[PDB]
Motif scaffolding. Sequence first.
Motif, PDB file in Angstrom:
ATOM      1  N   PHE A  67      -7.494  -7.630  -3.584  1.00 22.69           N
ATOM      2  CA  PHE A  67      -8.648  -6.942  -2.804  1.00 22.69           C
ATOM      3  C   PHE A  67      -9.316  -5.974  -3.721  1.00 22.69           C
ATOM      4  CE2 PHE A  67      -5.656  -8.409   0.083  1.00 22.69           C
ATOM      5  CZ  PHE A  67      -6.320  -9.119   1.172  1.00 22.69           C
ATOM      6  N   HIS A  68     -10.682  -5.736  -3.600  1.00 21.47           N
ATOM      7  CA  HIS A  68     -11.524  -4.487  -4.309  1.00 21.47           C
ATOM      8  C   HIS A  68     -12.090  -3.609  -3.031  1.00 21.47           C
ATOM      9  CE1 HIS A  68     -14.725  -3.006  -6.992  1.00 21.47           C
ATOM     10  NE2 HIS A  68     -14.097  -2.183  -6.737  1.00 21.47           N
ATOM     11  N   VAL A  69     -11.478  -2.653  -2.730  1.00 23.38           N
ATOM     12  CA  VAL A  69     -11.869  -1.817  -1.764  1.00 23.38           C
ATOM     13  C   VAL A  69     -13.114  -0.808  -2.431  1.00 23.38           C
ATOM     14  CG1 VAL A  69     -11.423  -0.013  -0.153  1.00 23.38           C
ATOM     15  CG2 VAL A  69      -9.802  -1.795  -0.458  1.00 23.38           C
ATOM     16  N   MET A  70     -14.530  -1.570  -2.011  1.00 25.08           N
ATOM     17  CA  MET A  70     -15.748  -0.598  -2.585  1.00 25.08           C
ATOM     18  C   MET A  70     -15.997   0.588  -1.780  1.00 25.08           C
ATOM     19  SD  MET A  70     -17.465  -4.017  -3.834  1.00 25.08           S
ATOM     20  CE  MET A  70     -19.102  -3.180  -4.421  1.00 25.08           C
ATOM     21  N   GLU A  71     -15.976   0.402  -0.425  1.00 23.53           N
ATOM     22  CA  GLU A  71     -16.279   1.836   0.443  1.00 23.53           C
ATOM     23  C   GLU A  71     -15.007   1.785   1.344  1.00 23.53           C
ATOM     24  OE1 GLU A  71     -20.106   0.966   1.917  1.00 23.53           O
ATOM     25  OE2 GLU A  71     -20.621   0.172   0.074  1.00 23.53           O
ATOM     26  N   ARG A 112      -1.426  -7.406  13.663  1.00 22.11           N
ATOM     27  CA  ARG A 112      -0.004  -7.301  13.983  1.00 22.11           C
ATOM     28  C   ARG A 112       0.822  -7.353  12.763  1.00 22.11           C
ATOM     29  NH1 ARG A 112       0.513  -4.792  19.036  1.00 22.11           N
ATOM     30  NH2 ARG A 112      -1.239  -5.606  20.108  1.00 22.11           N
ATOM     31  N   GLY A 113       2.133  -6.904  12.859  1.00 24.58           N
ATOM     32  CA  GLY A 113       3.025  -7.067  11.898  1.00 24.58           C
ATOM     33  C   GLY A 113       3.106  -5.611  10.923  1.00 24.58           C
ATOM     34  N   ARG A 114       3.437  -6.182   9.597  1.00 28.72           N
ATOM     35  CA  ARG A 114       3.517  -5.163   8.807  1.00 28.72           C
ATOM     36  C   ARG A 114       1.945  -4.559   8.737  1.00 28.72           C
ATOM     37  NH1 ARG A 114       8.328  -4.404   7.057  1.00 28.72           N
ATOM     38  NH2 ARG A 114       9.978  -6.135   7.363  1.00 28.72           N
ATOM     39  N   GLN A 115       1.708  -3.262   8.310  1.00 25.26           N
ATOM     40  CA  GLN A 115       0.550  -2.493   7.958  1.00 25.26           C
ATOM     41  C   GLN A 115       0.516  -1.816   6.735  1.00 25.26           C
ATOM     42  OE1 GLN A 115      -0.570   0.024  11.626  1.00 25.26           O
ATOM     43  NE2 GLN A 115       1.454  -0.700  12.240  1.00 25.26           N
ATOM     44  N   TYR A 116      -0.609  -2.035   6.192  1.00 27.43           N
ATOM     45  CA  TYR A 116      -0.674  -1.526   4.874  1.00 27.43           C
ATOM     46  C   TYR A 116      -2.054  -0.757   4.596  1.00 27.43           C
ATOM     47  CZ  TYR A 116       2.561  -5.079   4.103  1.00 27.43           C
ATOM     48  OH  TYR A 116       3.769  -6.207   4.340  1.00 27.43           O
ATOM     49  N   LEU A 117      -2.073   0.457   4.113  1.00 27.37           N
ATOM     50  CA  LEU A 117      -3.273   1.295   4.283  1.00 27.37           C
ATOM     51  C   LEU A 117      -3.784   0.932   2.654  1.00 27.37           C
ATOM     52  CD1 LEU A 117      -5.190   3.765   4.898  1.00 27.37           C
ATOM     53  CD2 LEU A 117      -3.807   5.046   3.129  1.00 27.37           C
ATOM     54  N   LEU A 118      -5.422   0.525   2.749  1.00 28.26           N
ATOM     55  CA  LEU A 118      -5.942   0.218   1.605  1.00 28.26           C
ATOM     56  C   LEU A 118      -7.047   1.421   1.746  1.00 28.26           C
ATOM     57  CD1 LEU A 118      -6.572  -3.358   1.828  1.00 28.26           C
ATOM     58  CD2 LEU A 118      -4.781  -2.298   0.743  1.00 28.26           C
ATOM     59  N   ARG A 119      -7.019   1.985   0.363  1.00 28.97           N
ATOM     60  CA  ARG A 119      -7.847   3.165   0.130  1.00 28.97           C
ATOM     61  C   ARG A 119      -8.908   2.702  -0.925  1.00 28.97           C
ATOM     62  NH1 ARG A 119      -4.467   8.550  -1.227  1.00 28.97           N
ATOM     63  NH2 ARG A 119      -3.960   7.202  -3.039  1.00 28.97           N
ATOM     64  N   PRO A 120     -10.071   3.393  -1.180  1.00 31.34           N
ATOM     65  CA  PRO A 120     -10.872   3.004  -2.147  1.00 31.34           C
ATOM     66  C   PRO A 120     -10.206   2.418  -3.506  1.00 31.34           C
ATOM     67  CG  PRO A 120     -12.068   4.701  -0.869  1.00 31.34           C
ATOM     68  CD  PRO A 120     -10.345   4.643  -0.408  1.00 31.34           C
ATOM     69  N   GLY A 121     -10.495   1.634  -4.076  1.00 32.84           N
ATOM     70  CA  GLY A 121      -9.981   1.283  -5.400  1.00 32.84           C
ATOM     71  C   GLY A 121      -9.569  -0.325  -5.392  1.00 32.84           C
ATOM     72  N   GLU A 122      -8.797  -0.669  -6.395  1.00 30.97           N
ATOM     73  CA  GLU A 122      -8.418  -2.067  -6.886  1.00 30.97           C
ATOM     74  C   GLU A 122      -6.744  -2.316  -6.439  1.00 30.97           C
ATOM     75  OE1 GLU A 122      -9.583  -3.031 -10.917  1.00 30.97           O
ATOM     76  OE2 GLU A 122     -10.627  -0.903 -10.903  1.00 30.97           O
ATOM     77  N   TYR A 123      -6.935  -3.619  -6.078  1.00 28.75           N
ATOM     78  CA  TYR A 123      -5.466  -3.973  -5.484  1.00 28.75           C
ATOM     79  C   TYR A 123      -5.278  -5.286  -6.098  1.00 28.75           C
ATOM     80  CZ  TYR A 123      -5.671  -0.206  -2.358  1.00 28.75           C
ATOM     81  OH  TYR A 123      -5.575   1.037  -1.954  1.00 28.75           O
ATOM     82  N   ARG A 124      -4.843  -5.481  -7.320  1.00 24.38           N
ATOM     83  CA  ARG A 124      -4.840  -6.758  -8.216  1.00 24.38           C
ATOM     84  C   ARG A 124      -3.512  -7.643  -7.512  1.00 24.38           C
ATOM     85  NH1 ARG A 124      -7.027  -2.582 -11.541  1.00 24.38           N
ATOM     86  NH2 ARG A 124      -8.476  -3.714 -12.897  1.00 24.38           N
ATOM     87  N   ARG A 125      -2.431  -7.281  -6.774  1.00 26.12           N
ATOM     88  CA  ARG A 125      -1.542  -8.123  -6.258  1.00 26.12           C
ATOM     89  C   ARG A 125      -0.816  -7.275  -5.272  1.00 26.12           C
ATOM     90  NH1 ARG A 125      -0.463  -7.334 -11.845  1.00 26.12           N
ATOM     91  NH2 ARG A 125      -1.458  -9.065 -13.081  1.00 26.12           N
ATOM     92  N   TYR A 126      -0.051  -7.994  -4.541  1.00 26.31           N
ATOM     93  CA  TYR A 126       0.578  -7.127  -3.281  1.00 26.31           C
ATOM     94  C   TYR A 126       1.350  -6.156  -3.714  1.00 26.31           C
ATOM     95  CZ  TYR A 126       4.623 -10.132  -4.658  1.00 26.31           C
ATOM     96  OH  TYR A 126       5.802 -10.657  -5.367  1.00 26.31           O
ATOM     97  N   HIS A 127       1.977  -5.931  -4.906  1.00 31.75           N
ATOM     98  CA  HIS A 127       2.782  -4.768  -5.035  1.00 31.75           C
ATOM     99  C   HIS A 127       1.915  -3.346  -5.100  1.00 31.75           C
ATOM    100  CE1 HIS A 127       4.464  -8.040  -7.267  1.00 31.75           C
ATOM    101  NE2 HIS A 127       5.563  -7.666  -6.749  1.00 31.75           N
TER     102      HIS A 127
END
Length: 173
Positions: free
Chosen positions: A123-127, A139-154
């Motif tokens: 994912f690439h969070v642009m805004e 539902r289930g596990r939750q993960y915050l995405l802030r502006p920036g780059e997420y190359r893989r689940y780690h």
Amino acid sequence: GKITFYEDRGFQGRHYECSTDHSNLQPYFSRCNSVRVDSGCWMLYEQPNFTGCQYFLRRGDYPDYQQWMGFSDSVRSCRLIPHSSSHRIRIYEREDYRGQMVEITDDCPHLQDRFHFSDFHSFHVMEGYWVLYEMPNYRGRQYLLRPGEYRRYHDWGAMNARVGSLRRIMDFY
């Protein structure tokens, strides 16, 4: 923003009023079984330094940790999420922004059923600020995405690659 943590359910026991990010809540309470969110959007973390399980909370009363989809009564750090005037994310089929992509500015309760492809690994969070969830319908596990780059689940603090839905963080009036 303002949030209050209570050691016992139903808003009883030792409580702590908070209006800031905290990397360590253990000095103020040892367990959290209910919460009152006066205002703001918050990401709560099971372990110190913004680690372990993550939970999104917004304005309102949470009499039991199950109400924030808690894995347990552990809360040991927290972030106040700042305002987002807009939301934009690029979703990629493969790790490191490879494969098919779609760019969205709205929520998605079912990733698999909605696009022109069915696998989701970067994912690439642009805004804006988002919550990524393990399962459909938030539902289930939750993960915050802030502006920036997420190359893989780690990069988003997951122990595996299972994802199912995506929500913009907006306030609850």
